[PDB]
């Protein structure tokens, strides 16, 4: 199922999207992207609107 995760930090912008079949599918697919900045933030799961909230 297609999804859209958003990232926003104290003074850092962010915005992207990705598809996931399970709650872990997006967590395992993002674990490779998070390395880009090397952050340790968290991601929320909102199927009601199909959007994941993240704070860098």
Residues 3/54, Cβ–Cβ less than 8 Å: no
- Helix, strand, or coil here: 24? helix
Locus of tokens 């909102």: 46
Nearest by Cα to 25 from 52, 7, 6, 54: 52
Structure-solving method: NMR
Options 3.10.20.10, 3.30.70.660, 3.40.50.1970, 3.40.50.720; CATH for 1-56 is 3.10.20.10
d(CA 35, CA 3): 20
Q: Which DSSP state fits 43?
A: B
Secondary structure of the chain: what % helix, strand, coil (to 5)? 20, 25, 55
Q: Look at residue 36 and give its three-state secondary structure.
A: helix
User: What residue spans define the domains of the chain?
Assistant: 1-56
Contact 5, 44 (CB under 8 A): no
29: helix, strand or coil: helix
**43 and 55 in contact (C-beta within 8 Å)?**
no
């Amino acid at each position: 199922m297609t999804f859209k995760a958003i990232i926003n930090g104290k003074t850092l912008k962010g915005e992207t999207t990705t598809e996931a079949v399970d709650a872990a599918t997006a967590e395992k697919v993002f674990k490779q992207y998070f390395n880009d900045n090397g952050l340790d933030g968290e991601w929320t799961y909102d199927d009601a609107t199909k959007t994941f909230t993240v704070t860098e």
